[PDB]
Amino acid sequence: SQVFGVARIFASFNDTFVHVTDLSGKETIARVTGGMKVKADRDESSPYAAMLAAQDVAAKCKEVGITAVHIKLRATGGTKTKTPGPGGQSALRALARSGLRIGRIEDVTPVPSXSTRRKGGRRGRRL
Amino acid sequence: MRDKWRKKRVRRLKRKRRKVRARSK
Amino acid sequence: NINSKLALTIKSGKYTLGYKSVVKSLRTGKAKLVIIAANTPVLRKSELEYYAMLSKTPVYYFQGGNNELGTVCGKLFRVGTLSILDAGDSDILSSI
């Protein structure tokens, strides 16, 4: 029945990624970011830009032959923050409002089992 | 003056005073 | 706990020390147990166990070298091999 792809969404406070692959993840269908939706560098994480990027990805996956996508969600991960950036939620809502069938949503943020040292120093970024 | 840097100033001063001393035994 | 069992045998039982004494006790049949240190040469160790086989005597292979085996017997010199002549108030014979 429904043909499933993998819509892997990388949301960060600098840019948001909406990028669909096959079930193995080996083959790329589309990859659209908010930097292709806004001219200004500050606006790449804006939820509007992510929603537009997600609709573009929807159109591409439709003209490819993809009907449904499994959502893969992640933040920056590693030593960075664990909460996904602003664009992820808007992109997810857009994908569920384009006639695309939604599979299983998951968060795969890279979580260290205690790791290397974050940048900044022990006093941290001082603003 | 943040006494920490007051001590650091004396350390550098006392380091140099020990250079001038060794110049003439 | 062999080092404990052999320590008691030295304290209370009967024994002889050294390669030449052991061989004599194997010839006369008075040896009850032959113990060989780990760093004893194989030619001597194989010679001892051939004597042990002829006289129906068991052999115990001690983990440490002659420095350790001498210390375990409470001595200040190296012991490459020893034979127990009478266990005393110890069950080293049955425990090995």
């Binding site: - | - | 760093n39 070298g65 002659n66 420095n67 190296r78 490459g80």
Partner: protein
């Protein structure tokens, strides 16, 4: 009496070559000329003949070793590593 405070065996070099060079030599020369325990007869009679050659005056067995000590750390690690890989292969 304690004849020298710190130079030790490198007192033969007098005041020459620099203190760091003499102190580095002292560490290896003490090991070079030391008596070691034989793993074959159990006596402290192992001495260096030449670099990498260690003889026992008692049982007359020569073992290849380090330049200045009988065994080096890398060789010790190899024995364990070769020991380990041996049983993991024969099983």
């Amino acid at each position: 009496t304690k004849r020298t405070k710190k130079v030790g065996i490198t007192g033969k070099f007098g005041v020459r070559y620099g203190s760091s060079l003499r102190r580095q030599t002292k560490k290896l020369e003490v090991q070079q000329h030391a008596k070691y325990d034989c793993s074959f007869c159990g006596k402290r009679t192992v001495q260096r003949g030449a670099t990498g050659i260690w003889n026992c005056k008692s049982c007359k067995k020569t073992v290849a070793g380090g330049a200045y000590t009988v065994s080096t750390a890398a060789a010790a690690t190899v024995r364990s590593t070769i020991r380990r890989l041996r049983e993991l292969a024969e099983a």
